[PDB]
Each structure stands twice: as structure tokens, then as C-alpha cells.
Amino acid sequence: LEAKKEENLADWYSQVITKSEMIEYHDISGCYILRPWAYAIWEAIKDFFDAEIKKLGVENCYFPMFVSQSALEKEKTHVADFAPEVAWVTRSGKTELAEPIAIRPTSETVMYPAYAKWVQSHRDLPIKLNQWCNVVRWEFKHPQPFLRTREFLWQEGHSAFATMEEAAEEVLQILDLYAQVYEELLAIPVVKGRKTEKEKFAGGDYTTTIEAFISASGRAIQGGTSHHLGQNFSKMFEIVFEDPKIPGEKQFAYQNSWGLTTRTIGVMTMVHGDNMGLVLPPRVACVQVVIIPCGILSEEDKEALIAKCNDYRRRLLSVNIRVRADLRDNYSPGWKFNHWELKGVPIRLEVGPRDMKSCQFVAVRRDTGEKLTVAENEAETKLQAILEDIQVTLFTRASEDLKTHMVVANTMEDFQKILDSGKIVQIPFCGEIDCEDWIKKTTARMGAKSLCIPFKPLCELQPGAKCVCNPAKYYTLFGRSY
Amino acid sequence: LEAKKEENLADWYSQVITKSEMIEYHDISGCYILRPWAYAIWEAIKDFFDAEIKKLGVENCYFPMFVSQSALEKEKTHVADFAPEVAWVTRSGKTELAEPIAIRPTSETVMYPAYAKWVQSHRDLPIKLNQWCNVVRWEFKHPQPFLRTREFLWQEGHSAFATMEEAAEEVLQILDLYAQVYEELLAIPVVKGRKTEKEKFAGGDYTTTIEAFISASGRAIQGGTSHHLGQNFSKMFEIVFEDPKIPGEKQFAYQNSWGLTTRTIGVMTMVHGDNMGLVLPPRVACVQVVIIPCGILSEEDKEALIAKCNDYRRRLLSVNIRVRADLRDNYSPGWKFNHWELKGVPIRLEVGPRDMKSCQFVAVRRDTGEKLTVAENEAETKLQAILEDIQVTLFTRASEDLKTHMVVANTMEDFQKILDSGKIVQIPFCGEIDCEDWIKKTTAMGAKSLCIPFKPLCELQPGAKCVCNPAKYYTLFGRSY
Ligand SMILES: O=C(NC1Cc2ccccc2C1)c1nccnc1NC(=O)C1CCCCC1
Ligand SMILES: O=C(NC1Cc2ccccc2C1)c1nccnc1NC(=O)C1CCCCC1
Ligand code: PRO
Numbered sequence: 025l026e027a028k029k030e031e032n033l034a035d036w037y038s039q040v041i042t043k044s045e046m047i048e049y050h051d052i053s054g055c056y057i058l059r060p061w062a063y064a065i066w067e068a069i070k071d072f073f074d075a076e077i078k079k080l081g082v083e084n085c086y087f088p089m090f091v092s093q094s095a096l097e098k099e100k101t102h103v104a105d106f107a108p109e110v111a112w113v114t115r116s117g118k119t120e121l122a123e124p125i126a127i128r129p130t131s132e133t134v135m136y137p138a139y140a141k142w143v144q145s146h147r148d149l150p151i152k153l154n155q156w157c158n159v160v161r162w163e164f165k166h167p168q169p170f171l172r173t174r175e176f177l178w179q180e181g182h183s184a185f186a187t188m189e190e191a192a193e194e195v196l197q198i199l200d201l202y203a204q205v206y207e208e209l210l211a212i213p214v215v216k217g218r219k220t221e222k223e224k225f226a227g228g229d230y231t232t233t234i235e236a237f238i239s240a241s242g243r244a245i246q247g248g249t250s251h252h253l254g255q256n257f258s259k260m261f262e263i264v265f266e267d268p269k270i271p272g273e274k275q276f277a278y279q280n281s282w283g284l285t286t287r288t289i290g291v292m293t294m295v296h297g298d299n300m301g302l303v304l305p306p307r308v309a310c311v312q313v314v315i316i317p318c319g320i321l322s323e324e325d326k327e328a329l330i331a332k333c334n335d336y337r338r339r340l341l342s343v344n345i346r347v348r349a350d351l352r353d354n355y356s357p358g359w360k361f362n363h364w365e366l367k368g369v370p371i372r373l374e375v376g377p378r379d380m381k382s383c384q385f386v387a388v389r390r391d392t393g394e395k396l397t398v399a400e401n402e403a404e405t406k407l408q409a410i411l412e413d414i415q416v417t418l419f420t421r422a423s424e425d426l427k428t429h430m431v432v433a434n435t436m437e438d439f440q441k442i443l444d445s446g447k448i449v450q451i452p453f454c455g456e457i458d459c460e461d462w463i464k465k466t467t468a469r470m471g472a473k474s475l476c477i478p479f480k481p482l483c484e485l486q487p488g489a490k491c492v493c494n495p496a497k498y499y500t501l502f503g504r505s506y
Numbered sequence: 507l508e509a510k511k512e513e514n515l516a517d518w519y520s521q522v523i524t525k526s527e528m529i530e531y532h533d534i535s536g537c538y539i540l541r542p543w544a545y546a547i548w549e550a551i552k553d554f555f556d557a558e559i560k561k562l563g564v565e566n567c568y569f570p571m572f573v574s575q576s577a578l579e580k581e582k583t584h585v586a587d588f589a590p591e592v593a594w595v596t597r598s599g600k601t602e603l604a605e606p607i608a609i610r611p612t613s614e615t616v617m618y619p620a621y622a623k624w625v626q627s628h629r630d631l632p633i634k635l636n637q638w639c640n641v642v643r644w645e646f647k648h649p650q651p652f653l654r655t656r657e658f659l660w661q662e663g664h665s666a667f668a669t670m671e672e673a674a675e676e677v678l679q680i681l682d683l684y685a686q687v688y689e690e691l692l693a694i695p696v697v698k699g700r701k702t703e704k705e706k707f708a709g710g711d712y713t714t715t716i717e718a719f720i721s722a723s724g725r726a727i728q729g730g731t732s733h734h735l736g737q738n739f740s741k742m743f744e745i746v747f748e749d750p751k752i753p754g755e756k757q758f759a760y761q762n763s764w765g766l767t768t769r770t771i772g773v774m775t776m777v778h779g780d781n782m783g784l785v786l787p788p789r790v791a792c793v794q795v796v797i798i799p800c801g802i803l804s805e806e807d808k809e810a811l812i813a814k815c816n817d818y819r820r821r822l823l824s825v826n827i828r829v830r831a832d833l834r835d836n837y838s839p840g841w842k843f844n845h846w847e848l849k850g851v852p853i854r855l856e857v858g859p860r861d862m863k864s865c866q867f868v869a870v871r872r873d874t875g876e877k878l879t880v881a882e883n884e885a886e887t888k889l890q891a892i893l894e895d896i897q898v899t900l901f902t903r904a905s906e907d908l909k910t911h912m913v914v915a916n917t918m919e920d921f922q923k924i925l926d927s928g929k930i931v932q933i934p935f936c937g938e939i940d941c942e943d944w945i946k947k948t949t950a951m952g953a954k955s956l957c958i959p960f961k962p963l964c965e966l967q968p969g970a971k972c973v974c975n976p977a978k979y980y981t982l983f984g985r986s987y
């Protein structure tokens with residue numbers, strides 16, 4: 025790895041993702057191969073998220089990837105927003121299909137006619153379904169692996185309710201889980217918030233979101249979303265039920281949908297990645313500790329060196345640490361050091377003959393570079409500590425970054441200045457589509473746009489305060505965006 | 507449930523898949539919704555299969571759904587066989603794409619240019635990759651949920667090796683795991699075989715397979731496949747390495763591919779289903795035991811009855827049995843019986859006021875129907891024991907069916923007779939492409955070759971003739987899905 029993060033980011037990213045063996049390029053643009061090293065991160069995100077939504081009563085399922093023209097261009101607004109970026113299938117082999125079929129950009133239009141069939145009374149609710157699948161949004165903006173791709177893996181949850189109370193409860197429950205994924209697993213702090221009128225999910229009542237900041241970009245990125253759809257969809261798809269306690273009055277279901285994707289891995293790369301390459305937080309790292317023999321003159325002494333590598337491995341397995349021992353003899357110690365640094369392994373455990381004699385090993389923390397000489401009988405205690413402290417450090421540094429590039433401005437002039445150093449700004453705002461488009465026009469002379477309206481904003485808004493422009497309604501976090 | 511398995515099978519199947527809440531229909535022909543109850547079975551297969559391939563050094567990954575037209579055509583025998591069931595994306599919104607992009611029917615031509623890029627020497631071998639994903643084969647043939655669909659979920663494993671010895675070892679390892687899924691997980695007997703020339707995977711050298719028999723229709727079905735691709739693909743995609751032994755000579759990689767699908771769930775339905783609905787082999791059942799409070803009266807006794815089911819629950823969880831206590835006051839005991847029988851749960855645990863006070867319960871086995879009054883002391887014993895007997899029973903039952911519907915026919919005339927009683931026959935067969943086409947024409951609806959069984963029923967005697975050409979091998983032939 026030659027390229028440096030501080031100067032050229034695009035070249036750095038492309039080198040980091042390929043040399044870590046996370047990503048290979050495909051001949052179709054906007055499409056990327058997720059290799060084992062990347063896919064394992066997603067698998068850890070899944071193991072956690074799945075277990076958590078199961079407690080909330082959600083069940084896993086699989087719906088078809090194809091939507092009919094009828095199901096789609098039946099209902100407006102939602103379909104109106106996605107329409108341009110929907111990939112259409114128009115032939116099998118040489119045979120033109122009589123009716124074009126669409127690839128899923130999201131599964132509302134696929135799921136809800138099935139929900140309408142399954143809802144026939146109050147006791148068929150709630151319906152709480154999730155799926156792990158691929159989705160396609162065939163946009164032409166500059167793609168980047170993980171962050172911005174045409175095909176991507178996600179989960180999508182869709183729940184339908186008798187009462188608004190249960191639905192509103194679920195939206196926030198889910199949004200906290202998405203925040204838990206970013207802060208606990210990936211050591212990325214997030215701003216919980218609400219989307220503006222312009223940015224909200226097309227058909228829905230409201231949209232909650234977690235935002236994260238990428239230092240080197242000077243840009244922010246939506247990292248997860250939880251919608252309340254209200255009854256907008258239940259009315260369009262006739263998901264209705266009678267309740268004999270409200271005679272005759274048809275009750276349209278209350279709905280949420282929620283989504284999280286492999287963008288999660290890209291954000292991780294952007295935040296914690298350095299000039300040595302990938303940096304894995306221990307909690308998602310599929311290899312937490314890599315054991316490497318050094319000094320490798322007798323056959324018996326090399327055998328014993330290998331054995332001490334295996335002892336360290338088994339001990340680490342016993343305190344629930346994910347450990348590989350690179351005992352391959354085709355490559356030098358120095359080659360392996362660089363190989364596993366690039367891949368982002370939290371801890372490299374060096375074992376040489378002189379250190380065996382001394383009853384020590386070297387633990388090399390990937391975040392700090394910290395060469396630490398550790399006593400042999402403390403491996404478990406100290407590795408754990410370093411591991412959990414690597415997590416805490418990565419979170420601390422990224423938090424410190426966040427409350428450094430997230431600041432408050434009250435006027436258009438002071439918004440403009442702060443913004444062009446690579447920062448994100450909470451400004452007083454009136455929430456108008458017109459007022460938001462104008463901001464984008466002016467702020468570009470790479471235009472800036474809104475991110476979220478935070479649940480815990482930095483300041484309270486003054487009684488009678490004018491929007492950075494009609495009076496304001498809330499502080500709205502704005503910025504340059506992915 | 508309205509239809510009877512033996513009078514109208516399709517209607518029966520349609521009723522069992524929907525009434526058990528396994529399948530919903532979609533508005534596109536050939537595409538089906540896998541609801542929770544079906545998808546849980548796939549997840550049990552996945553848990554089993556993933557752990558097994560990880561021991562073999564295989565890793566999970568995700569390659570794109572889309573193939574460029576150049577990549578897809580690179581291996582010519584492969585492309586031609588698949589080209590007419592390939593779905594092509596030609597636009598996004600109104601915005602036409604510069605170049606029509608194809609949806610994967612299998613990932614060979616997606617993955618292998620990446621494999622060429624990754625192999626720079628023999629130290630980069632082996633590559634062993636697997637993915638769980640959906641694929642699309644847009645066939646106009648008559649569709650059937652699980653068994654025969656346009657889009658389905660599967661795993662596809664793709665490995666590349668330096669030597670042919672390494673690759674042939676894996677082909678059979680994977681097939682043995684496929685056999686374990688059917689036999690150990692689904693309590694379905696299978697026959698391990700090799701495909702014929704007409705039926706082998708188009709790009710490859712040889713295809714190993716598993717066949718399962720479905721009594722009710724008299725038809726066999728391909729359960730999964732494991733192909734040795736040889737060097738046919740590595741030559742086309744340039745997956746090459748050198749050896750410092752003979753400097754300057756390129757060796758092409760030896761390749762395998764292997765797939766298994768959600769067809770598994772349909773085969774299980776077809777084999778073990780009855781006129782009371784689905785029957786679940788406990789080994790893949792997400793709910794092994796359902797506890798239903800019966801005979802529902804004073805609230806203290808009514809709640810002590812609820813209290814008894816929860817003890818039965820907790821004591822069952824404790825010996826790692828998958829249990830549900832259906833303690834909803836919304837639905838009558840009778841409704842609960844029917845609903846969990848339709849979903850095919852292995853044991854119904856009936857707790858009624860009278861039997862609770864007499865320190866017992868009823869356990870109702872789903873497979874045979876029988877009801878056992880069982881003392882409360884022997885719960886975790888008799889219930890673990892019962893789950894284990896149901897697993898064997900279903901296997902034995904389907905095994906005895908196979909041992910009775912697979913037989914030997916040594917002439918073409920008596921091949922016809924045995925075949926028309928809804929049987930599958932092992933014949934002496936020459937192996938040739940047209941003699942295989944001829945077996946289909948004359949038997950119509952036609953009967954096709956399923957596999958050449960690793961271990962046929964009998965020994966092909968000194969210079970035996972075929973059904974046509976002398977007999978090269980005994981071959982399992984039948985009416986087919
Ligand atoms: O949006 C994405 N791509 C579109 C934007 C873009 C840019 C350039 C070329 C193509 C495209 C398509 C995307 N790509 C990868 C991972 N994740 C994504 N979205 C999310 O994470 C969102 C948050 C959660 C719910 C779903 C959206
Ligand atoms: O073959 C299948 N579909 C095609 C045939 C057909 C029939 C009617 C309408 C559409 C189509 C498309 C299919 N469908 C569902 C599940 N599994 C399948 N194949 C397998 O299990 C085989 C064994 C494993 C490897 C892949 C093939
Ligand atoms: O596309 C979206 O954003 C919503 C959330 C997941 C499912 N659909």
C-alpha cells in the first residue's frame with residue numbers, strides 16, 4: 025500500500041479494499057464482488073441484528089425479486105420516486121416477454137398484496153417479517169464499493185399493526201438497534217434523527233435515520249433507516265380488517281419498514297482505515313488475533329516454536345477469541361506482518377526463539393502500532409484488555425472526530441464558511457422543500473443538503489427564530505453527502 | 507384440508523403448502539413467497555450444510571447477480587444450454603442501458619474471471635468459495651412451488667484445485683453431505699449416482715447426483731448435484747499457474763461446482779405429507795413439540811393449567827428440545843390441534859384439567875397419528891425418545907417405499923409394465939445419447955435417465971445386452987420432475 029488517506033481518498037480506498045481482499049471489481053459498473061474477508065463482517069452484523077429482531081418478534085422469510093408492472097404502476101408517490109432507478113427485465117434468451125418484469129428496488133410493492141391476503145381480522149396482526157436479500161437501484165451517480173452501489177445486500181423489515189402505538193414503538197426500537205450496530209459492533213458514533221420533508225420516504229408518514237460522519241471525505245452518509253409508513257400503504261394495497269368493537273368501520277393497518285445494508289462495512293473502512301490499510305474493530309473482526317512465528321536453526325527448535333504458536337492459539341480459543349495462526353512456511357515473517365496489517369487484524373501475536381526463552385510474546389495492536397511486550401501467562405487477560413481497549417479507542421477517536429466536525433451556525437454566511445473546511449452544521453430550519461433546494465443552489469457557490477433533525481440537537485431553538493434564509497421549526501443537521 | 511393426496515395430487519400439494527403457511531402465490535407465474543414456516547426449514551438445512559463445508563475449508567462470499575454478454579458466452583457448451591432460460595435486463599426506468607445485462611442462472615461465468623485474476627501461482631490454490639443466493643431460470647415449462655420454479659434460493663460452491671486428485675475427492679465429499687441432508691435431516695432416502703451423457707452438466711466432465719422418489723406421482727426428482735468441471739472452464743477463462751519444476755508450462759486449474767436448493771422442502775412435503783397436512787422430520791422442525799392447554803371453569807384452575815404448560819415448556823427447553831406453548835386464549839383447543847397438525851409439528855402435548863391432576867399428559871405423534879398417555883415423570887425422556895422414533899419411522903417408511911418402487915427390469919417390454927404401475931426401474935443401458943432419446947419416445951409423459959447408481963441392485967452379467975449396443979451399466983430410469 026503506497027497511497028495515503030490524507031491526500032487522495034479515492035485511490036486509498038480502492039487500494040485498501042482490494043489489498044485487504046475484501047473487494048474484487050466486476051465488469052458491470054456499480055457492482056462489486058464481496059470476498060470472504062468482507063462477507064464475514066456482514067455475517068457478524070447479521071448474527072447480532074437477527075438475534076435482536078427475533079426478541080422483538082420478527083420472523084425471517086423470502087419474497088420474490090420480481091415485481092409485476094401491475095403491482096408497481098398501480099400505486100403512486102412511492103413508485104413515482106423509485107421508477108427511474110428500477111431495472112427492468114424484458115426478455116428470456118431471444119424470446120421477448122409479453123409483459124416486462126421489474127427487479128426489486130425495495131419490497132413494499134412485492135410484500136403488501138400478500139399482507140392484504142393474510143389480514144382478515146384483528147388476530148392476524150401484527151405481521152412482522154424480515155428478509156436478508158439483494159436489491160437493485162440502477163442509478164448512474166458515481167458508485168463506490170460498499171457505500172454506493174447498484175446491487176447491494178441488506179435486510180429489510182416490514183411490520184403491520186392494529187394500533188399506531190405499537191408501530192411508533194417499533195420504529196424507535198429498530199433505530200436504536202441500528203445505532204447499536206454502528207456504535208457497539210463497528211465503533212462508529214451516530215446522530216439519531218428525522219428526515220426533512222424533501223428527504224422522507226416517498227409514501228410514508230415519517231422517516232427516522234442514523235447519520236455518520238467520514239472525516240477524510242468532509243462528507244456524511246445515511247447508515248440505516250426506520251420508516252413509519254402510517255396507513256399510506258395499507259390504503260393503497262387494501263390491508264384492512266373489521267373489529268366488531270368499531271362496527272363496520274374498516275381499519276387500515278399501521279405500517280413500518282426498516283433497512284440496513286453492507287454500506288456498514290464501507291463506513292467502517294472510511295472511519296477507522298489508516299495508511300497501513302484496513303482496521304477492524306475487534307467485535308466484527310473475523311480474525312481478532314493472528315499468530316506468527318519469527319526468527320525461523322534446528323528441526324527440533326522450529327518444531328517447538330510451532331508448538332508454542334499452537335498453545336497460544338488454543339488458549340485464545342478458550343477465552344472466546346477468534347484466532348488464526350499463520351504457520352505457512354512459503355512466506356517470510358515480514359511478508360506476514362504486512363499481509364495481516366493490510367487485512368486489519370486487531371492483534372498480531374509475534375513468537376520468536378528469544379521471546380520463548382524469556383517467556384514473552386509481542387502483541388502488536390493494529391490501531392496504535394503499539395509494540396507491546398507481554399508476559400506469557402497473562403495472554404488471556406491482556407489480549408482481552410487490548411481487544412476491548414482497541415474497540416474503545418476506535419470509538420473514542422471517532423467520537424472525538426465527530427464532536428469536532430459537528431458544530432452550530434445560525435446565519436447563511438457562517439453556515440457557508442464552517443462547511444467548506446469539511447464539517448457538518450446544525451442550522452435553524454423551516455423544513456420547506458423550496459427552502460431546501462435554494463440552500464443547495466446557493467451552498468454550491470459540490471452542493472450541500474440536509475441529513476437529519478436530531479432527537480438531542482446541540483441547542484434549543486429560540487422563540488421566534490428565523491430560518492437561515494418564514495420562521496424556523498427546528499435545528500437541522502446539514503452537510504455534504506453520499 | 508379438502509383434497510386427498512392420492513386422488514388429486516397437485517390440488518393436495520397446493521392446499522398443504524398454503525394451509526401450513528409455507529407458501530403464498532405471487533402475481534408472476536413461477537415465483538413463490540417463502541413464508542416463515544418454509545424458510546425455517548431452509549435455515550436448518552443452511553445451519554447443517556454451512557458448518558459441514560467450513561470443515562472442508564470452504565468460505566462464504568457474494569458475487570453479483572449480473573453477467574455481461576461477453577463473460578456469459580466464454581464457455582460455449584455452457585452458454586448454449588442456458589442461453590434460452592436467461593433473463594436479460596435492458597432498461598432502468600425509461601433509461602435504456604448501453605449494453606443488455608443478464609441475470610445469473612448459475613455463477614460460473616460471474617466468478618471465474620475473478621478466479622483467473624486471483625490465481626498467479628500454485629500457492630493461490632485451492633480456491634474454495636460458496637454463496638447462498640437466488641438464481642433465475644426463466645423456463646416456460648409448468649411451474650410447481652419448491653420443486654420447479656423460475657427463481658429459487660440455493661447454495662452454489664465453486665472450487666479450483668492444482669491437481670485432479672484433489673478435485674475428485676471433493677466432488678464425492680459434497681455429494682455425501684447432500685445425501686446427509688436428505689437422509690439425516692429430511693428422513694428421505696436417496697440414490698447416489700452419476701448422470702448420463704445427455705443429462706450431465708453441459709460445461710463439465712462428469713456430474714454426480716442424488717435422486718429421490720415421490721410415490722404419489724410415481725416420479726423421481728434430482729435432489730442436488732456435484733460436478734467435476736475438469737479444465738473445461740479454466741481453459742476458457744484462463745485460470746492458469748506455472749510450476750518451477752517444468753519452467754514455462756502453464757497448467758489449467760481443475761474445477762468443481764455443486765448446488766442444492768429449496769426443492770429440498772418440496773421433496774420433504776411430497777414424501778412425508780398426509781391428508782392431515784404437512785409432516786415435519788423433527789431434525790428440521792423449528793417447533794418440535796407444541797403444548798396446548800385442553801378442556802377449557804374457575805380462573806384459579808384455568809391459570810394452574812397455564813402454569814402446568816409453562817413447566818412442561820421450561821423442562822423441555824432444558825433438554826434442548828424445540829418447544830412452543832400455544833397459550834393464546836384467542837383460539838379454541840380444537841383450532842390449535844388442527845393448526846399445528848397442518849404445520850406438521852412432530853408432537854402435540856395435550857394438558858387437560860383431569861390429566862393434570864392425575865399427574866400425566868397426552869403426547870400425540872404426528873407421523874402415525876397415535877396418542878400416548880404418558881406419565882409426567884417421563885416427559886423429557888419419552889419426548890426425546892419419541893422425537894427420535896418419529897425421525898427413524900419416516901425414514902424407514904420412505905426407505906421401505908423406495909425398496910419396493912425401485913426394482914430391476916432386464917427387458918424393454920417388462921420395463922414398460924413395471925413403469926406403468928408408478929415405479930422406477932434399474933435397467934441394463936448402453937449409455938448412448940440417441941438410445942436414451944429412444945427410451946423416452948417409446949415410453950409415452952416419457953421416462954428419462956435419472957442416474958447410473960454408484961451401487962446398483964444387481965451385477966451386470968457377462969456381456970449383457972441393453973434395452974435397445976451392449977450394456978455399459980445398470981441405469982435408474984423413470985418418469986421425472
Ligand atoms: O443507496 C445505495 N445505492 C444507491 C445510491 C447510488 C449511488 C451511485 C450509484 C448507484 C446507487 C444506488 C446503497 N448502496 C450500497 C449500500 N447501501 C446503500 N444504501 C443504503 O444504505 C440506504 C440506507 C438504508 C436503506 C436503503 C438505502
Ligand atoms: O431447476 C429448477 N428450476 C428450473 C426448472 C423449471 C421447471 C419449471 C419452471 C421453471 C423452471 C426452472 C429448480 N427450481 C426450484 C428448485 N430447484 C430447482 N433445481 C434444482 O434443484 C436442480 C438441482 C440443483 C442444481 C440446480 C438444478
Ligand atoms: O427502501 C427503504 O428505504 C425501505 C426500508 C427497507 C425496506 N424499504
Ligand code: PRO
Binds near residue numbers: 707
Ligand atoms: O447449476 C449447477 O448445476 C451448478 C452447480 C452449482 C453451480 N452450478
Ligand SMILES: [Zn+2]
Binds near residue numbers: 455491492
Ligand atoms: Zn427557510
Ligand SMILES: [Zn+2]
Binds near residue numbers: 935941974
Ligand atoms: Zn441401448
